[PDB]
Design an enzyme around this catalytic site. Structure first.
Site, PDB file in Angstrom:
ATOM      1  N   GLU A  86       0.827  -1.207   0.000  1.00  0.00           N
ATOM      2  CA  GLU A  86       0.000   0.000   0.000  1.00  0.00           C
ATOM      3  C   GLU A  86       0.860   1.255   0.000  1.00  0.00           C
ATOM      4  O   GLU A  86       1.223   1.787   1.056  1.00  0.00           O
ATOM      5  CB  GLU A  86      -0.940  -0.001   1.197  1.00  0.00           C
ATOM      6  N   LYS A  96      -2.368  -2.335  -3.357  1.00  0.00           N
ATOM      7  CA  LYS A  96      -3.439  -1.505  -2.821  1.00  0.00           C
ATOM      8  C   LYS A  96      -3.105  -0.044  -3.052  1.00  0.00           C
ATOM      9  O   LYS A  96      -2.669   0.643  -2.109  1.00  0.00           O
ATOM     10  CB  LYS A  96      -3.630  -1.782  -1.335  1.00  0.00           C
TER      11      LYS A  96
END
EC number: 4.1.2.13
Lengths: 343, 343, 343, 343
Positions: B186, B228
């Site tokens: 992420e 992500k």
């Protein structure tokens, strides 16, 4: 800050060319052989190396039957060849463009040793490359070729070789796209030596990762490039044997882990493979049951023209015979890049 | 030389988990909110922050109607929550695994300033991470989450911020895969500031290129990871307006130029977007007329649970009402990740 | 593994040359001006630009009084000038070597734009550089010069400019040392713009750090190189004023934080400074109360030959007068590089 | 842009500490041994490992005769030891500061495997390091120690190991300087294996080049750091023999090619060398006829305290005897770091 390297129009013409070259069923013939290499092969066939024998042989290839039109999407030419005319009077660029090919050219000046390494080389020829690309662009060449060489070895390829060759490739591609020419990135990894697939796959992944990081650093527009890698294969001296499906799975796997999907197409080298084996491996690649988000096709210098060369013999009356052999291979490899080929 | 980080069995379990999480129609609920953040939101709703209010709220989310079973593929939990039991007596990991979810956990310790930069931070928590991941793996957690933050600014993100955060992400992912846990990478880029799409897309491409180069250097197995990122959007203070199709095209375009197709799935952040706007943007992404070689789906902390939270009010008799709101959003976003959603 | 780039003998000749050039009290005259630049200055003096005016002017410099023998340790020549003879009949290389100078030559082909950046350039001319260096080595040239340009700007120098220029410098130096020629590394940072010392020092440190990392990657032998940086100074448009001692402290400080002590000598650019100011700044540098583990001396193209040029006027009877001016400056700068100069 | 990591005052206190530690004739005693290592050595001496035996032994070292005052410039302590009191009642930090030492502490948490490499490790412990350094700073610790380990091997150290360890070192040093503590950078290269000097020198140069590039990227203030490398020596299993002057020349040569002169001092490891051999090698280093622009001195854990340990035997009445041995070594190494030592 962002200072766009290319305006939307430039990006559009680049992507259009790149899609024309790899358009489905189509591949690239590599005629780019320099006077040294073509000297070797014309000596193999037992004919003297002269400008006329070269020009005639490249007529044999370029003037071939119309059955190769929905096969060859582009033709890579050596410098000299752009300025040679067919005996009909048409320049070879117009001969190629007439039947629907795209003209490429070989812009590198060859390999230079890297000092401090073990037999490792870099590639040469970035000087004046922008003026040269402007000139070739005026002469009808829509894409360029650059060849960098990496050998698998004991402690090689070293970090220096990978870094340096990736940097030169990216710099080359930057110049080419500035001049409106689609670069074909070719990080060839030599089959020489004895090494199993696993190592060729490992090295291939490292090289392609470095290449695309370098292309990101140089602000290269990926939809306007083509990739020309070598299939992942064991070394010539490797004793272990591998099915064609293993070679296909290793190649596609190495590509999916590195090449981002924006890249337009992937045109494989033959790399000293047998003339028939190249199309079988390429077929097995296109039959792999994975998801391949780009065109997988051929760029074959030798694997197309071997049989035509040997069948020509240097005798003009053999012309038709020679060309027919060439046509065969072309058709075969066309089927190969669609996955529909069978031997 | 190659010393494989993972044996074929390890690779197989990783890829299997990763495919279960993003399996078609499915997405991730992020419950990972720490006592600080959930403290903020429980104060917003006007209820005291206590272990019992937290546990009850996460029952409200985790115990929701079976209509969410073919929706939530995974649930990201905070540490504490793994060890809390539902009032029925089942531990939350078994509550989630029972109806077909996969359990994740948030393993980072938060952000630390980078000295010498302008307000730039790195992420923390690599110490003892392998023992922690072994423990979480014994407790039923099959995937991990790590959040690194990058802000677009005048001269930021600096090369140091990009390099450092990419390195920490890759090191995190290495440890997680060694312990049999699918890492979710992420690299969030904050929407704060005023900047047009073009700059968010430029920065996003640079960041993702650095991330995947770093994952290549650390020998990460990409089929066993998820990505992500944040959708590419203008800054909050940007005056220019953009259609949802422009945001979709910018996002998919930024992904195709970086993320290699081997990556299993891409789970977007909501990133402070409106609760409904998130599913519209996600839908427009899945309707983009490009070739997307991976699963594009949602990981939504706020955009799923906002309406449920506000409708719960901290009153237990509101429970059913609250859950229903949640279910709605889940279903919507499920349609969104299939491209079939309409408002 | 280590595959030594240089044998001990090669290392010895390199270090010997490098010590001869910067030997105490000695500095470098830069005559390397190309037909374009010398065209500008011969137009400034109001004389036509012809091969004969150039050759005569470079006689004016090279044939100057013996009082410059314990001053000039090396003379950088342009290509053409190596092959020109003094009217006495001696080739300029023998004119220079006779009175104790070392012959250098300018091997770069100039600057090329980097696409995607803001006005940033790289340097050109690595093609055929090894054959050229072998030829120059046969012709008496013992050291080479390469100039790469970096401009301080809003968001510049970018990471790409620094990386690329450092790489080209290191590649250049590798080739030169392979051929037995001492490379002089010149990462010039243009004074253009308005920026205080602190920023020129910051940028200078970043550039030199990247340069020496690149020289480490390419296996360069540092005792066989010279460094040619620019003094750390505010931009031309900077309003704030700085004493010469502040400029000296900033320069020496920037050097001590980057350049490793193995480097033989540091030869500063004049960089558009006033003819007298250059020797004052250089003096203040050599008087700095820090520990400087290398020879700090001058390489001055303009700051030596300005007064001689203007005093020559393009009239041969002015010859003696012109040369005398030159001699003055030489002597002054000699004192400057010993710290004993006073105006 | 520049956002200074440190204000001039911070820079001044850092440089002042760093100069106090390496001040001429002075070196560092490493008491930092963890309960595991000191457990090994207290088992070697045949005494039980308890908090009291440890504390008493470290009294034996810290309370030693005043003849060691113009010898030990700093003392590296383990965590526990900071909070232990001498039986006189003074805390060890005040015992050390009273007679003129500077207190360091070992802040790393140990080594962790790097997956995908061959037996290569990285170092751990960056979590919460800023709060820990603030606490240690309140407790009197003026400098910190961090140990990263690199082993020479067939294909090792890999690029990943060098990059990763350099990055962690630089990140550590950044945090320490933010909190007002002088970091000591220790990239130890293990002597294990059979390799000649030339390879240890090659590897050492590569490692130090990467370390200082990483310290440049992280905006580290070099005048506020110390370097703690290992002397360049053949592996334990290497059959070829080397004079002490060859080891000295290899060490100084490796340092001059990498470490920039701004670094305050270089404190060598003993690295399993004989107790007497360490001071002979250090002497030969300080007698090398090159220009060394920094303080070359000792940080010796074992090479100082070996004889004292064995002579103590774990019996309190041996105390004086033990301390005397220690004092001897201290004095010797003091002479060693001045080049005036003879055996």
């Amino acid at each position: 800050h962002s200072h766009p390297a290319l305006t939307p129009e430039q990006k559009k013409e680049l992507s259009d060319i790149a899609h024309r070259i790899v358009a489905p069923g189509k591949g690239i013939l590599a005629a780019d052989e320099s006077t040294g290499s073509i000297a070797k092969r014309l000596q193999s066939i037992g004919t003297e190396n002269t400008e006329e024998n070269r020009r005639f042989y490249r007529q044999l290839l370029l003037t071939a039957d119309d059955r190769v039109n929905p096969c060859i999407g582009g033709v890579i030419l050596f410098h000299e060849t752009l300025y040679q005319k067919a005996d009909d009077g048409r320049p070879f660029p117009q001969v190629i463009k007439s039947k629907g090919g795209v003209v490429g050219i070989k812009v590198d000046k060859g390999v230079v040793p890297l000092a401090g390494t073990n037999g490792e080389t870099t590639t040469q020829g970035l000087d004046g490359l922008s003026e040269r690309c402007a000139q070739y662009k005026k002469d009808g060449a829509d894409f360029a070729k650059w060849r960098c060489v990496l050998k698998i070895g004991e402690h090689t390829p070293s970090a220096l070789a990978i870094m340096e060759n990736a940097n030169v490739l990216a710099r080359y591609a930057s110049i080419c796209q500035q001049n409106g020419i689609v670069p074909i990135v070719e990080p060839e990894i030599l089959p020489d030596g004895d090494h199993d697939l696993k190592r060729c796959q490992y090295v291939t992944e490292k090289v392609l990762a470095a290449v695309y990081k370098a292309l990101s650093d140089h602000h290269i527009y990926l939809e306007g490039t083509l990739l020309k890698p070598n299939m992942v294969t064991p070394g010539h001296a490797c004793t272990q044997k591998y099915s064609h499906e293993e070679i296909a799975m290793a190649t596609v796997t190495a590509l999916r882990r590195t090449v981002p999907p924006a890249v337009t197409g992937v045109t494989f080298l033959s790399g000293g493979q047998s003339e028939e084996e190249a199309s079988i491996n390429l077929n097995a690649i296109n039959k792999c049951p994975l998801l391949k988000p780009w065109a997988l096709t051929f760029s074959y210098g030798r694997a197309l023209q071997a049989s035509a060369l040997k069948a020509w013999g240097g005798k003009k009356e053999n012309l038709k015979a020679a060309q027919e052999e060439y046509v065969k291979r072309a058709l075969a490899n066309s089927l190969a890049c669609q996955g529909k080929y069978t031997p």
